Design a protein around this ligand. Structure first.
Ligand SMILES: [Cd+2]
Ligand SMILES: [Cd+2]
Ligand SMILES: [Cd+2]
Ligand SMILES: [Cd+2]
Length: 30
């Protein structure tokens, strides 16, 4: 897993976790 704020995948978090920046909106993974 990565973060409970994303699915068990998220190509965005696949490289790590882009959620380290902000919460998780259209400017994060959405
Ligand atoms: Cd997340
Ligand atoms: Cd994500
Ligand atoms: Cd993540
Ligand atoms: Cd995110």
């Amino acid at each position: 897993s990565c973060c409970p704020c994303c699915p068990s995948g998220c190509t965005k978090c696949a490289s790590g976790c882009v959620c380290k920046g902000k919460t998780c909106d259209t400017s994060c993974c959405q």
